Amino acid sequence: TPIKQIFPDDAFAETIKANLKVTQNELNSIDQIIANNSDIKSVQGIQYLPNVRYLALGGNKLHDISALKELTNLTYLELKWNQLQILPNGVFDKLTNLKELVLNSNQLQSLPDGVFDKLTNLTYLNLAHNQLQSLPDGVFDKLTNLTGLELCGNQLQSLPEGVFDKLTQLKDLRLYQNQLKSVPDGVFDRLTSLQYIWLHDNPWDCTIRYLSEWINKHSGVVRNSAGSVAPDSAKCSGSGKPVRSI
Amino acid sequence: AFAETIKANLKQNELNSIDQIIANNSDIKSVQGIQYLPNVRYLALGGNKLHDISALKELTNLTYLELKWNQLQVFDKLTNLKELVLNSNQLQSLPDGVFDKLTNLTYLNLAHNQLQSLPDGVFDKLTNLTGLELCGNQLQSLPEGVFDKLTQLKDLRLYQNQLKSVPDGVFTSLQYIWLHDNPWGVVRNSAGSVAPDSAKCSGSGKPV
Amino acid sequence: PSVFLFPPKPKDTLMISRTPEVTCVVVDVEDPEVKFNWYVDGVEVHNAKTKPRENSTYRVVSVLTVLHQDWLNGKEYKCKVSNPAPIEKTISKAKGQPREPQVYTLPPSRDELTKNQVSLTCLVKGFYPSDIAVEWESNGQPENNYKTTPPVLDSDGSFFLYSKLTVDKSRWQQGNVFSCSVMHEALHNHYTQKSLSL
Amino acid sequence: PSVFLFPPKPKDTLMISRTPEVTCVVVDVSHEDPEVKFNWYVDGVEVHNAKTKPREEQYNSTYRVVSVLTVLHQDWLNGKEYKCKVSNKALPAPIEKTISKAKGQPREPQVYTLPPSRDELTKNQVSLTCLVKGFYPSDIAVEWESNGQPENNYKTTPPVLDSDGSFFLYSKLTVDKSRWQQGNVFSCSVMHEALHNHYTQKSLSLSP
Ligand SMILES: *[C@@H]1O[C@H](CO[C@@H]2O[C@@H](C)[C@@H](O)[C@@H](O)[C@@H]2O)[C@@H](O[C@@H]2O[C@H](CO)[C@@H](O[C@@H]3O[C@H](CO[C@H]4O[C@H](CO)[C@@H](O)[C@H](O)[C@@H]4O[C@@H]4O[C@H](CO)[C@@H](O)[C@H](O)[C@H]4NC(C)=O)[C@@H](O)[C@H](O[C@H]4O[C@H](CO)[C@@H](O)[C@H](O)[C@@H]4O[C@@H]4O[C@H](CO)[C@@H](O)[C@H](O)[C@H]4NC(C)=O)[C@@H]3O)[C@H](O)[C@H]2NC(C)=O)[C@H](O)[C@H]1NC(C)=O
Ligand SMILES: *[C@@H]1O[C@H](CO[C@@H]2O[C@@H](C)[C@@H](O)[C@@H](O)[C@@H]2O)[C@@H](O[C@@H]2O[C@H](CO)[C@@H](O[C@@H]3O[C@H](CO[C@H]4O[C@H](CO)[C@@H](O)[C@H](O)[C@@H]4O[C@@H]4O[C@H](CO)[C@@H](O)[C@H](O)[C@H]4NC(C)=O)[C@@H](O)[C@H](O[C@H]4O[C@H](CO)[C@@H](O)[C@H](O)[C@@H]4O[C@@H]4O[C@H](CO)[C@@H](O)[C@H](O)[C@H]4NC(C)=O)[C@@H]3O)[C@H](O)[C@H]2NC(C)=O)[C@H](O)[C@H]1NC(C)=O
């Protein structure tokens, strides 16, 4: 088959024409694809390259990622800034070799229960600056190897209790720029390896005695938007006074 | 002026630790003080406005002397000199045998000055010379035997001068000679190519 | 009005004890006043600096601090200058699947042991991307008489380099043990240390 | 309307078997006036031996016209200064740029081959490294060869400024662990101006 016949997306043909500079043995020689900000609409045909391990698809206009369901040798998946709207269920269940998943700045409205649960090898998950209002109960519980979790810039109304249960290896948790009023008691008490937490720019209801006590105990993992260590950055709603000061 | 080269070279005993001075296309008129730093070896002075090199007559250990484009119009005491660059000056002659002491010299560039004469025996006292440049002068006297005491010479440039003939017999190491623009496999042309017919007979322009 | 974007120093993204930063640089530009907006991953930030200004060279610079592991994670940094219309430019860590560097240490040529000081060399081949740190150290303290060549693209599409540490042959021949330390994203703990002695 | 002046390749100027050239590139010459006039001056004297290439448009919808000039013999090594001057309608005064070999006293490179790390003999392919240290200027050329005929599977590091002002670099030749172990003798050849005959060749192999 020619370049034009396997891939109906103009841009996606242009990137498979650039990678190889075709035979199925040729198509089975493709280990990575770098095709970011390349004006791409659908990856129809990406199912015939089962040995691809690295996939750079950020900055494109994807709606459906259905054709990646079986690519079982993937480990890096970067889909930052596309047009994804909701996440089909089980679509990640087969990517059990993923270590890093970047769903940065899409239009995702919600997460189905247990969509990540077949990704036990993940260390990095970027869901920041989407449109999430809430999170499936213990969605982050099969994700035991998770070193960084980014959620900032959403409209998160509230966090499930123990939602961060099986995340001992977590070192970086990002929550700033959310519509958070309070956190479950003992949501963070198991986050043992946590070295960076981001909590500023949240309407902290200080009506707030667990978080006020968790921050003083860990008065060195909180960082403001500039990077400097700064625990007075989580400000109470209305008053504007720092949380840790109550 | 000259001091800012020193202030940049040295970012007393301090002038002794200066072996090389790189300071070309500056605005230097005097080089005075250049005797107060003896252990100095490399000297680059191209693009200044000098006329005296009196201050240098006693830098005995220097091995490179670059004097391109200066207003020159002394060498006996720096025998370790190896490469002496003296093109684009205005010098109208050359003292009768000031190249005799520096036996170790190997590159002499006298191109584009103003030499109608050549003191006989000035070239005979430096056998290991590799290149010699006399192009762009007022040459008209090419003294005889002058290139005979020069065996290791590989480049000898005589283009753009006023020679009407040569003592036949003045010309083994030699691979490159230049004879063009004069109005009478080792010869080349100004464009870098073995070109034996580039020696055109005056007026008739007939190669010979 | 020419604008450029320069990535943080690998020594800073891998040592973490240091603050990395991305340096935006505008030259050419009478009107030496330029507003700088910054964006990480498509979202505007305001934490950036600006240094005092500097042919009549308009070397006005804005530096922006890297948060934690944002660089290695693959965040994209965009600088936006204004007076023309706004000129935007983006910079990001090199895309492609990382590869772990091999580090081998290589003692001085016998023929060099005739000179007041010898050369110890550290060969680091086959890493990706080229972002990498290399340093030397002896018995607990660090050395400092070393130079490291820049990454070089290799036949297999990865990088290599060498660091040459220079010590007094009296110090090599005594049997002292020097250590080449190397910091890259594809190394466990971002870190490996190789040693060599007589 | 911008000009860029590249030097000759070291490989050309140290082999002379190959023909060195100094290239003057101009880009952004379009449309309006596509007329460029190069003037060349070697050591300050204008010269007319430059054959100019035909102009060439690119997807920038602008022109990039090249002039190339031949280097007469050791002129680059001897320190000749090459100046390019472009005149186009699209700018006030003509543009000028001079290029010349780096000033500073020449220093001989030291050349040392290094056999593979023991931990590298646990692999299919080993690295033979060449250490060239202590040369000036940077103009240098490095090659590898096995049994008289050449090896073509090495990458060379660009010259690096060392703590004493000289340069150094490494050359990594990759080979099969078997060729190394069978006891073949490989060579790192080096071409530089401060070398006798501008050449040196160091060899490495294992003998039990
Ligand atoms: C008025 O003069 C000033 C400055 O004068 C200068 O200094 C004096 C003393 C004299 O020497 C002058 O002759 C000289 O001009 C002019 O200002 C210059 O403007 C030019 C562009 O016009 C800049 O060129 C860029 O330089 C970068 C690299 O910059 C680093 O290295 C330079 C030296 O090599 C140095 O100048 C820089 O300061 C800088 O040094 C590094 O900077 C960081 C930040 O501090 C630091 O962490 C590093 O440690 C440090 N490293 C050092 C010192 O070693 C170069 O990469 C740029 O090239 C890109 O774009 C080009 C288009 O012009 C193109 O040729 C290239 O292909 C390249 O394109 C990019 O390539 C890379 C790699 O692939 C990649 O990013 C992309 O592929 C691609 N991106 C694209 C296309 O977008 C560029 O050449 C000068 O740096 C700057 N001089 C200084 C000191 O800043 C001024 O222009 C004059 N005014 C005029 C003519 O009108
Ligand atoms: C539109 O048209 C063209 C084409 O666009 C280009 O081509 C296409 C295919 C795409 O790739 C595009 O991405 C690309 O933009 C544009 O033309 C370009 O314009 C820029 C600057 O305006 C030029 O950059 C300068 O070039 C030299 C290096 O150029 C060599 O290396 C390139 C790749 O590495 C190669 O592409 C070039 O062809 C060129 O190749 C060499 O050519 C010779 C002989 O032909 C050969 O012998 C060489 O071996 C070969 N080298 C190779 C292959 O590697 C670079 O050195 C310049 O940097 C100096 O000047 C800067 C000022 O801008 C300054 O910042 C730098 O620091 C540095 O300054 C000098 O540095 C040294 C020591 O540090 C010293 O002399 C001085 O301090 C200082 N001197 C100064 C300032 O004068 C610089 O990067 C591109 O070459 C040029 N591309 C081509 C193909 O010509 C054009 O700009 C576009 N115009 C528009 C949009 O309007």
Short mmCIF file of N, CA and C in Angstrom, two decimals, chain B residues 99-163:
data_model
loop_
_atom_site.label_atom_id
_atom_site.label_comp_id
_atom_site.label_asym_id
_atom_site.label_seq_id
_atom_site.Cartn_x
_atom_site.Cartn_y
_atom_site.Cartn_z
N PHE B 99 68.85 41.42 6.50
CA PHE B 99 68.35 40.06 6.61
C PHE B 99 69.45 39.01 6.84
N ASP B 100 70.71 39.44 7.01
CA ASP B 100 71.80 38.48 7.07
C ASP B 100 71.90 37.79 8.42
N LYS B 101 71.52 38.44 9.52
CA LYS B 101 71.72 37.84 10.84
C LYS B 101 70.73 36.70 11.10
N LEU B 102 69.45 36.94 10.83
CA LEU B 102 68.36 36.01 11.13
C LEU B 102 68.39 34.83 10.15
N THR B 103 69.32 33.91 10.44
CA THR B 103 69.51 32.70 9.66
C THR B 103 68.34 31.74 9.79
N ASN B 104 67.67 31.74 10.93
CA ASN B 104 66.57 30.84 11.21
C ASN B 104 65.27 31.22 10.49
N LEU B 105 65.20 32.38 9.84
CA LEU B 105 63.97 32.83 9.20
C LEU B 105 63.58 31.90 8.06
N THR B 106 62.28 31.74 7.87
CA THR B 106 61.74 30.79 6.90
C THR B 106 60.59 31.32 6.05
N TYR B 107 59.92 32.40 6.48
CA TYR B 107 58.91 33.08 5.68
C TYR B 107 59.17 34.58 5.68
N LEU B 108 59.43 35.15 4.51
CA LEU B 108 59.59 36.59 4.36
C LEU B 108 58.52 37.08 3.40
N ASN B 109 57.69 38.03 3.85
CA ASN B 109 56.63 38.62 3.02
C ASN B 109 56.92 40.11 2.83
N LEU B 110 57.48 40.46 1.67
CA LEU B 110 57.71 41.86 1.33
C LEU B 110 56.76 42.34 0.23
N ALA B 111 55.56 41.76 0.15
CA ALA B 111 54.68 42.04 -0.98
C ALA B 111 54.04 43.42 -0.85
N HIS B 112 53.80 44.05 -2.00
CA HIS B 112 53.20 45.38 -2.11
C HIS B 112 53.85 46.36 -1.13
N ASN B 113 55.14 46.61 -1.40
CA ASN B 113 55.83 47.81 -0.93
C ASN B 113 56.25 48.62 -2.14
N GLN B 114 57.42 49.27 -2.05
CA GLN B 114 57.94 50.16 -3.08
C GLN B 114 59.43 49.88 -3.15
N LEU B 115 59.80 48.85 -3.89
CA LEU B 115 61.21 48.49 -4.03
C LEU B 115 61.56 48.50 -5.51
N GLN B 116 62.35 49.49 -5.92
CA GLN B 116 62.94 49.45 -7.25
C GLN B 116 64.28 48.72 -7.25
N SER B 117 64.95 48.63 -6.10
CA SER B 117 66.25 47.98 -5.95
C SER B 117 66.12 46.77 -5.03
N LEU B 118 67.19 45.97 -4.99
CA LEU B 118 67.32 44.87 -4.04
C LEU B 118 68.79 44.71 -3.65
N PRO B 119 69.19 45.19 -2.44
CA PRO B 119 70.59 45.03 -2.02
C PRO B 119 71.10 43.60 -2.18
N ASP B 120 72.09 43.44 -3.05
CA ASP B 120 72.66 42.12 -3.32
C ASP B 120 73.20 41.51 -2.03
N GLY B 121 73.04 40.19 -1.92
CA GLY B 121 73.55 39.52 -0.75
C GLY B 121 72.69 39.63 0.49
N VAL B 122 71.54 40.31 0.41
CA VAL B 122 70.64 40.36 1.55
C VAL B 122 69.88 39.05 1.70
N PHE B 123 69.64 38.35 0.59
CA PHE B 123 68.88 37.11 0.67
C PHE B 123 69.77 35.89 0.87
N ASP B 124 71.09 36.02 0.76
CA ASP B 124 71.95 34.85 0.67
C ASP B 124 72.23 34.20 2.02
N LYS B 125 71.92 34.88 3.13
CA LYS B 125 72.29 34.46 4.47
C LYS B 125 71.14 33.82 5.26
N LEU B 126 70.22 33.12 4.59
CA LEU B 126 69.11 32.45 5.28
C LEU B 126 68.63 31.31 4.39
N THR B 127 69.28 30.16 4.55
CA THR B 127 69.16 29.12 3.54
C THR B 127 67.82 28.42 3.63
N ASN B 128 67.35 28.18 4.85
CA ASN B 128 66.05 27.56 5.05
C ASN B 128 64.97 28.64 5.04
N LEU B 129 64.68 29.13 3.85
CA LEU B 129 63.52 29.97 3.60
C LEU B 129 62.54 29.14 2.79
N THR B 130 61.27 29.10 3.22
CA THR B 130 60.27 28.35 2.45
C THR B 130 59.51 29.21 1.45
N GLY B 131 59.18 30.44 1.82
CA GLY B 131 58.40 31.32 0.96
C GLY B 131 58.96 32.73 0.96
N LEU B 132 58.89 33.36 -0.20
CA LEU B 132 59.39 34.71 -0.38
C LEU B 132 58.41 35.47 -1.26
N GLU B 133 58.00 36.66 -0.83
CA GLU B 133 56.97 37.45 -1.53
C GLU B 133 57.48 38.85 -1.88
N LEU B 134 57.70 39.08 -3.17
CA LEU B 134 58.11 40.38 -3.70
C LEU B 134 57.08 40.96 -4.67
N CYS B 135 55.83 40.51 -4.61
CA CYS B 135 54.83 40.95 -5.57
C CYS B 135 54.34 42.35 -5.23
N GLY B 136 53.99 43.10 -6.27
CA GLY B 136 53.38 44.41 -6.05
C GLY B 136 54.37 45.47 -5.63
N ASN B 137 55.59 45.41 -6.15
CA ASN B 137 56.62 46.41 -5.90
C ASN B 137 56.99 47.11 -7.20
N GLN B 138 57.90 48.07 -7.09
CA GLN B 138 58.47 48.75 -8.24
C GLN B 138 59.73 48.05 -8.76
N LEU B 139 59.83 46.73 -8.59
CA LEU B 139 61.03 46.00 -9.02
C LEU B 139 61.38 46.32 -10.46
N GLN B 140 62.69 46.35 -10.74
CA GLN B 140 63.18 46.51 -12.09
C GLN B 140 64.62 46.03 -12.11
N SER B 141 65.23 46.00 -10.94
CA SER B 141 66.53 45.38 -10.74
C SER B 141 66.31 44.11 -9.95
N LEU B 142 66.53 42.96 -10.59
CA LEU B 142 66.59 41.68 -9.90
C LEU B 142 68.05 41.22 -9.90
N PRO B 143 68.86 41.66 -8.92
CA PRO B 143 70.28 41.28 -8.86
C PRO B 143 70.50 39.79 -9.05
N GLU B 144 71.67 39.45 -9.60
CA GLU B 144 72.00 38.09 -10.02
C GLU B 144 72.55 37.26 -8.87
N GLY B 145 72.29 35.96 -8.93
CA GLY B 145 72.74 35.06 -7.89
C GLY B 145 72.02 35.26 -6.57
N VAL B 146 71.05 36.18 -6.52
CA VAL B 146 70.48 36.53 -5.23
C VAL B 146 69.62 35.37 -4.73
N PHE B 147 68.96 34.66 -5.64
CA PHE B 147 68.17 33.49 -5.27
C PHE B 147 68.96 32.19 -5.36
N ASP B 148 70.28 32.28 -5.50
CA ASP B 148 71.12 31.10 -5.66
C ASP B 148 71.46 30.49 -4.31
N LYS B 149 71.73 31.33 -3.32
CA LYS B 149 72.01 30.86 -1.98
C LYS B 149 70.73 30.40 -1.23
N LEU B 150 69.63 30.16 -1.96
CA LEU B 150 68.32 29.83 -1.39
C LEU B 150 67.84 28.51 -1.98
N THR B 151 68.09 27.43 -1.25
CA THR B 151 67.82 26.11 -1.80
C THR B 151 66.47 25.57 -1.37
N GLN B 152 66.09 25.79 -0.10
CA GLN B 152 64.88 25.20 0.45
C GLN B 152 63.61 25.95 0.06
N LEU B 153 63.72 26.97 -0.80
CA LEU B 153 62.59 27.80 -1.19
C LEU B 153 61.56 27.03 -2.02
N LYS B 154 60.29 27.09 -1.61
CA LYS B 154 59.21 26.45 -2.36
C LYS B 154 58.23 27.42 -3.00
N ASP B 155 58.11 28.63 -2.46
CA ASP B 155 57.22 29.65 -2.98
C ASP B 155 58.04 30.90 -3.16
N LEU B 156 57.96 31.47 -4.36
CA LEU B 156 58.70 32.68 -4.73
C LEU B 156 57.78 33.50 -5.63
N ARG B 157 57.41 34.70 -5.20
CA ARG B 157 56.36 35.45 -5.87
C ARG B 157 56.94 36.72 -6.47
N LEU B 158 56.73 36.91 -7.78
CA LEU B 158 57.29 38.05 -8.49
C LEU B 158 56.25 38.74 -9.37
N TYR B 159 54.96 38.49 -9.14
CA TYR B 159 53.93 39.06 -10.00
C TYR B 159 53.76 40.55 -9.71
N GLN B 160 53.23 41.28 -10.69
CA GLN B 160 52.92 42.70 -10.55
C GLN B 160 54.14 43.47 -10.06
N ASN B 161 55.11 43.55 -10.98
CA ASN B 161 56.33 44.35 -10.83
C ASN B 161 56.75 44.80 -12.21
N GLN B 162 57.83 45.58 -12.25
CA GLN B 162 58.32 46.15 -13.51
C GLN B 162 59.64 45.51 -13.90
N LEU B 163 59.67 44.19 -14.09
CA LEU B 163 60.85 43.54 -14.62
C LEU B 163 60.73 43.52 -16.13
#
